[PDB]
Amino acid sequence: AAQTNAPWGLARISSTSPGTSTYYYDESAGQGSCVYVIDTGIEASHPEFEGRAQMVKTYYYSSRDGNGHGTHCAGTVGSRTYGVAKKTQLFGVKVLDDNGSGQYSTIIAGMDFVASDKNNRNCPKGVVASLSLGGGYSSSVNSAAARLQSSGVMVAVAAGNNNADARNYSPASEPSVCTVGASDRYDRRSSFSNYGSVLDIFGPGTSILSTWIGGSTRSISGTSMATPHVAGLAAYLMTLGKTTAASACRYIADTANKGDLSNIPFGTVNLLAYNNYQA
C-alpha cells in the first residue's frame, strides 16, 4: 500500500533514504494487534481513529486527554493518516494529568495494569505498549517496565529530551525494554535527543505531524514522537508474523537502516527504524 503526501516520519520508516514523502506498508496494517498508549489519554472520538481507539483506564477525574500529548502519540501509532499501524487497536491509559505530569507510583500502577489488562483484550497478533514519558532514574519504575515486557508486551519507551546519556532516566534506562531516540528529516540526531548505550533504536522525532485534541492536528517534537513510530512498527511487524513481543526490539534493530544518522555519539547505536517493506 502507498500513502502519498505522508508525514515525513512515516515515509522515512519505509525508505532506505531521507527526503521522500510516500509511506509504503503491507495492507495488513497491524490488524489484530493492540497498542497501549500510556500517557495523558487519547481523544478516541477523533475521526482519525475510526472507532479503533478507546480509553481503558484513568487515575484522574476524567479519561479525557485535556493536554494533547497522548492523542498525538496515539495518532503516530495508529491514526488513519498519521499512523504507522493504521488498523491496530489503541488502548489509552491515562497516567499523566492534563498538564502532562504524573507521579511515579501512578505510572507504575499503569504499567502493571497493562500487563493484566491485555488478558481482557483481543490481540491475537500481539500487544505493544508505548511510553512517551519519563523522569529521573528509579529502580522501581525500571522494574515495572521490565515486568510489563516480561509479561509479553513489546514495551517501547522514550529516551528523553535532555541531550544527555539516557542511563540517568527511567524507564529509558531499563535494559530489557526498547529505548527510542529521535531523529530529524535530514537524518540528524534530534538536537534534544538523549543517547547512550541503553538506546536500542532511533525513530522520527523532530516536527512530527499527528492528531491533537479538539479534532485537530499539529506538528511537535520529542523522543515522545519517536517512540510511537517504533511502537506502531512493532505492532505492524507482529501482525505480519515477522517477530513477536519478546523479540521485536531486537528484530527492529537487526532490520534497521544502519549508519545513516549524523551526530550519534560514539557508543550509541546508529540504527533508524525501518519496515523493510518491498511492494
Numbering used by the authors: 1 to 279
Article sentences:
Here, a series of new methods are presented based on the use of a low X-ray-background film as a crystallization support and a photoablation laser that enable the automation of major operations required for the preparation of crystals for X-ray diffraction experiments. In this approach, the controlled removal of the mother liquor before crystal mounting simplifies the cryocooling process, in many cases eliminating the use of cryoprotectant agents, while crystal-soaking experiments are performed through diffusion, precluding the need for repeated sample-recovery and transfer operations. We have previously shown that the transfer of crystals to X-ray data-collection pins can be automated through the so-called CrystalDirect approach, which relies on the use of a thin, low X-ray-background film as a crystallization support from which crystals are recovered by excising the film with a laser beam and attaching it to an X-ray data-collection pin. The CrystalDirect system enables the automation of sample mounting and cryocooling and can contribute to closing the automation gap that currently exists between crystallization and X-ray data collection.
As an initial validation, crystals of proteinase K, thaumatin and lysozyme were prepared in CrystalDirect plates. These crystals grow from solutions that typically require the addition of cryoprotectants when mounted manually. The CrystalDirect approach provides a robust method for automated sample cryocooling without the need to screen for cryoprotectant agents, which is often a critical step in protein crystallography.
